[PDB]
Design a protein around this ligand. Structure first.
Ligand SMILES: C/C(=C/C(=O)O)C(=O)O
Ligand SMILES: C/C(=C/C(=O)O)C(=O)O
Lengths: 556, 555
C-alpha cells in the first residue's frame, strides 16, 4: 500500500523499533519542565479558548517532526485543498465532499460541476430559518389549530446520531422550543413508546433520509403517518405535520409529502457529515435557528484553522498524527473518547459513526489492499461515570488505550457555588495524571506500611496496588460548551478523520460495507412468513430461523 | 503466569499456529451441514427458551475439546464450588463472593464464617417487598400527604448501571409504578436538570452506595437534601423522602437517614454484582416486587445451569472459552455486544463495568504479573442502529471483532401485525450471515456486470465491493425479554466473566485500579480554589489547572 512504501513512514517505524522502551512519560516530564508549553496548542476562537494538551503522549520533538513530515509526504495539504475546492475526492462514488460548504459563513464561492453551490446552500438555510420561526412562535398550527409542542425526527444513522447528539449537548439552549424526540430503530418499541406519549394535534414529524429509501426510516414513517391519519382522518392535514429532509424529491413526493415541505441537501453531503445541512432541522427547531447558525459558525472557524494553520500547530492534523502513531506503530485497536460532561453523553456514539464508518476501510485509492491498520474502534462514556465502570481496565488491564479527555471550564449549571464542577474538574485532571504517573512498588509499599498493614497483609496486597502508568492521554479543555464551541469541536474531529484517511490512502467518504447486510436481509424477510422450515441458507441461519418459528407461538 | 505454563493452553496455541488457515467459515459450513446442531445449545428454562448458537465461530470439534480441556486443567469447576459454598475467593480483600446467595430462591443454606447468610438476605428482601407495596400503592405519603410519583436513584457505578439497565429493559412492566430517575455523575448538570422536573412533595430519593463514602454520590445526596429542605424546611420530613441502600450503617446515620430507612447488603456483594441486592430497590419500585422476584428467579435458574451442566454443554463456560480463544490466540482486543432490542440499549454499558472492571487485571493469585492478555474492551450499540454507524468497520475494516448478537423472538410491541419485528429479525439474521459468508471478487464482479458498469468503471470499483467475511459471531435468541429471562441472561454473562477470570488466574472481584485517581483528585480539589498558579504537579497537570483558572472568569 502507499503508506507502507512511504519513506517517512519507514523512518517512523524504524525509530519506534529502536527507541520504543525510551518513551516513559514520568522521565519525559521530569527531564523537560517546558514539556507542556512545547506539546500543547491554545486556540482562541474569539468565542472561547480551546486548549489541546497532547503533552501526556509517548512522543518527543523528533517524533512530532517525523509525523509532520509524514503528513507532508502523504500530501495532506493538497488533499485538503481538493476537498475545500469541491473536487470529487470521494473517488469510489465520483462525488465531491462538501460538508464545509454547508457552514461556509463567508459565502466564498465553492464550485461543483462549474456551478457555485452556496446559493443553494443558503436558500435551504433561509427556508429552515423561516420554518423554525413559525413553529417556535406558534404561527405554524396543527390540523385542529394548536401550536406544535413536540418534534419527532424519524431517521437512522447519519439522519439521527448528529441531531440527537447536538440537541442533547445543547439542552440548556432549548428554552421556548418544542420537545424533541428521536425515533431510529426499526424495532417497534422505539416508535410505539414514543407515539404513546404524543398528541397528534401538536406533533410535528420530520422524516430524515438522504436517499429516502432506508427501510427502517420509511417503515417508521408509514407507521407514524398511519397513526396520525387514524386521528386526523383528513389526508390534507399531513401537510401540516410531516416534513422531509432529503436529496430525493421524487421519493419524498411519492411518500405523500408536500414538495413545499422538503428541506433539500445534496449528494456531496455525507450522512455522517450531514447535521450541518437540512438534516439539522430538529436542532434548529429545538434551540432556535440563531443557535444553529452559531453551531455552523464554530465549525466554520475550525474549518479555517485547519486550512490556514501550519501543520506543526494545526490541531486536527496533530490529533490525526498522534492516532497514526498509536495505530500503526504501537498497534492500539481502539480510541476512547471521555467527555467530562453529562450533556455530551452521546458524543462518543456520534464519532463511532463519524470515525469508524469513515476509516473502517481496507482498499486504497489505487485499488490495493492495505497491508497496515486503518481506523480504530471508538468507544467511551462520560466522566466521572467511566471511572466507576471501566477505568479499572484502563489503569491495570493489559491494553494500551489512547484516550481523549474533554471538559468545559465553565458549567451550564454552577450549582452549590461551583462545588460540583470543581470536583468534576479535579477528577478530570487526576485521571490523566494517574494514567501518566502510576504508582511504583516502593510508593505502594510506603502507603501500606503507613496504613498499618502487617508484614503479611502488606506482602499479599502490595503487587495488586502497583500502577505501571505510562498510559497516554490527550486533554482537550474549552471555555464553555456553547453552540459555537460544539461546532468547532465536532469539526475538529471531522478533519482529524480526514487527515488519517489521506495518510492511509483510503476513502473516508464512502461506505460500501453496508450493502451486503442489506441484500441478505431482503432475502430473509419473506422467508419468515409462514411456518415452513427454511433450508436455503447455511446451517446456522437456517437453525436460527427455525428456532424463531418454533418460539413465535410459545406462551411464556 | 499460571495460564502460560498450562499444558492445555500450550496445546491450544500450538494448534492455532499450525491449523489457523483451516478456519474458514464458508468451507466449514459447506463441509458439515450438521454444524449448527453440533455447535449450539438450547436451554428450556420453563419460562422461555434460550438458543446459544456459537456455530459461526472459528472453531472445530477439536478446538472445542481443547478449550474444554483448558477449563478442566485450570480448575473452573473447583473454583465454581468455592464461590457457591461461601469461601473467600476474593482473596485480595479476604471476602466471599455471593451474589448467587442474593437470588438463592431455594434457600439452601450458604455459610460464611459458619453462619447462613440466607436469613439476612431474605430479611432485607422482605423489607424491600413491604416498602415497595407501601410506596406503589400510595400508602407511603410525602411530607404534605401526597403519594410518591417519582423515585430518584442517586448512585454511581455498581449502584447505578444495573438498576438503570434493568428498568430500561423492563419498562413495559412498570404500569402502576412511579417514574424512576437515575442521577450518577458528579457533573452538576445531572442532578440540576433532574431536580428541575420534580416536586419535593412527591419525590423519594434513594441514596445508593456500598461504602456510603463515594464522593460523587454523597455530594449529589447532600445537594438533593438541601433542595428538599428548602421546600419542606422540617428536618423530620427527610424520613419520608430519603432511604439508603448500603453496607455502612454508621455513615448512613451520619448523613441523617433513619436506620429504619436503610436497606442493607453485605461485603460479599460486589458493586458490579449488586442489582440483585437492596441496590435493586429502584427496580422493584418501578416494576413491582413480584417482577423483581422473577428477575432473581431467572438468575437463580442460570446459576443452577452453570453448577450442574457438564462443561462441554455449559453456556457461560462455552462463551468464556470462545472469548479466551479470540483473546489469547487471535489477539482480539475487544468484544462487541449488539442487542437487537431498543429496551436493552444500556446492556453493553452495564457489562462494560461487569466485564472490564472484573477482568481488567494484570496481577495473578500468586502475585505474579500476567504475561498474556486478560479482559477485553466491551462496547456496542443496539441493532439495527449500529448497522448504520460502525458496522462498516466490522465488515471491511482491519480489526477482528467477536460479536454477540442478541434478540427476543417475541416483541413487547407487536405493532403493524408484527411487521417491525419481522424486519428486525431479518436484519439480526442477515448481519451474522453477511459477516460469515462475505462476498468474493467473482460474486461482486457479477453484480457490477448486471448493473451495467463499463469495464473501466467495474474494475475501479470491484475491490471496494468485496467482503472478505470469515468474521465470527455468537447468536443468542430467547423467547421473550421478560424479567425472568433478563435475569437468566445477565447471570449467564456474570458466570462467563467468572470462568475467564479463573482461567487467567486473576481476581475477578476486586478493583484496586480505582484508588489512584481518587487519591490524586483529593489532592487537586483544594488547589483549584483561588487564582493562584499551581506548579506542584507535572508540567501538564499544572498547565491544565492554570488554563482552567484563567478561563474561569472569561465572559
Ligand atoms: C442511513 C441513511 C442512508 C441514506 O439514505 O443514504 C439515511 O439517511 O436514511
Ligand atoms: C462505586 C461505589 C463504590 C463503593 O461504595 O464501594 C458505590 O457504590 O458508591
Amino acid at each position: 500500500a502507499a503508506l507502507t512504501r512511504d519513506p517517512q513512514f519507514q523512518k517512523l517505524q524504524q525509530w519506534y523499533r529502536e527507541h520504543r522502551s525510551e518513551l516513559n512519560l514520568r522521565r519525559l516530564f521530569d527531564a523537560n519542565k517546558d514539556r507542556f508549553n512545547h506539546f500543547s496548542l491554545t486556540l482562541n476562537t474569539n468565542h472561547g479558548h480551546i486548549l489541546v494538551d497532547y503533552s501526556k503522549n509517548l512522543v518527543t520533538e523528533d517524533v512530532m517532526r517525523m509525523l509532520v513530515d509524514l503528513a507532508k509526504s502523504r500530501g495532506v495539504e493538497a488533499a485538503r485543498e481538493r476537498m475545500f475546492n469541491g473536487e470529487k475526492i470521494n473517488y469510489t462514488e465520483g462525488r465531491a465532499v462538501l460538508h464545509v460548504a454547508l457552514r461556509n459563513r463567508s459565502n466564498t464561492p465553492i464550485l461543483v460541476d462549474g456551478k457555485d453551490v452556496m446559493p443553494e446552500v443558503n436558500k435551504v438555510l433561509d427556508k429552515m430559518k423561516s420554518f423554525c420561526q413559525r413553529v417556535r412562535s406558534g404561527d405554524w398550527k396543527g390540523y385542529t389549530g394548536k401550536t406544535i409542542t413536540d418534534v419527532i425526527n424519524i431517521g437512522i444513522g447519519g439522519s439521527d446520531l448528529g441531531p440527537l447528539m447536538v440537541t442533547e449537548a445543547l439542552k440548556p439552549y432549548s428554552s421556548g422550543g418544542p420537545r424533541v424526540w428521536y425515533v431510529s430503530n426499526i424495532d417497534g418499541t422505539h416508535i410505539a413508546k414514543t407515539l404513546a406519549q404524543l398528541n397528534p394535534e401538536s406533533s410535528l414529524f420530520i422524516i430524515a433520509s438522504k436517499t429516502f429509501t432506508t427501510q427502517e426510516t420509511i417503515t417508521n414513517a408509514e407507521t407514524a403517518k398511519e397513526w396520525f391519519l387514524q386521528a386526523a382522518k383528513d389526508p390534507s392535514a399531513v401537510a401540516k405535520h410531516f416534513v422531509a429532509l432529503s436529496t430525493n424529491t421524487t421519493k419524498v413526493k411519492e411518500f405523500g409529502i408536500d414538495p413545499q415541505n422538503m428541506f433539500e441537501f445534496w449528494d456531496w453531503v455525507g450522512g455522517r457529515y450531514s447535521l450541518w445541512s437540512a438534516i439539522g432541522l430538529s436542532i434548529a427547531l429545538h434551540v432556535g435557528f440563531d443557535n444553529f447558525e452559531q453551531l455552523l459558525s464554530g465549525a466554520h472557524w475550525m474549518d479555517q484553522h485547519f486550512r490556514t494553520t501550519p501543520l506543526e500547530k494545526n490541531a486536527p492534523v496533530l490529533l490525526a498524527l498522534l492516532g497514526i502513531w498509536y495505530i500503526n506503530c504501537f498497534g492500539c485497536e481502539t480510541h476512547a473518547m471521555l467527555p467530562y460532561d453529562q450533556y455530551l453523553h452521546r458524543f462518543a456514539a456520534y464519532f463511532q459513526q463519524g470515525d469508524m464508518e469513515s476509516n473502517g476501510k481496507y482498499i486504497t485509492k489505487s485499488g490495493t489492499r492495505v497491508d497496515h491498520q486503518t481506523g480504530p474502534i471508538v468507544w467511551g462514556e462520560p466522566g466521572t461515570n467511566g471511572q466507576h465502570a471501566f477505568y479499572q481496565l484502563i489503569h491495570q488491564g493489559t491494553k494500551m488505550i489512547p484516550c481523549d479527555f474533554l471538559i468545559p471550564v465553565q458549567t451550564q449549571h454552577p450549582i452549590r457555588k461551583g462545588l460540583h464542577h470543581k470536583i468534576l474538574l479535579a477528577n478530570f485532571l487526576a485521571q490523566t495524571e494517574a494514567l501518566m504517573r502510576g504508582k511504583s512498588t516502593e510508593e505502594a509499599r510506603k502507603e501500606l506500611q503507613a496504613a498499618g498493614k502487617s508484614p503479611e497483609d502488606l506482602e499479599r496486597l502490595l503487587p495488586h496496588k502497583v500502577f505501571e502508568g505510562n498510559r497516554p492521554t490527550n486533554s482537550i479543555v474549552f471555555t464553555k460548551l456553547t453552540p459555537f464551541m460544539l461546532g468547532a469541536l465536532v469539526a475538529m474531529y471531522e478533519h482529524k478523520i480526514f487527515v488519517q484517511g489521506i495518510i492511509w490512502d483510503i476513502n473516508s467518504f464512502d461506505q460500501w460495507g453496508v450493502e451486503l447486510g442489506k441484500q441478505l436481509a431482503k432475502k430473509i424477510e419473506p422467508e419468515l412468513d409462514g411456518s415452513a422450515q427454511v433450508t436455503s441458507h447455511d446451517a446456522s441461519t437456517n437453525g436460527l430461523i427455525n428456532f424463531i418459528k418454533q418460539q413465535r407461538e410459545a406462551r411464556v
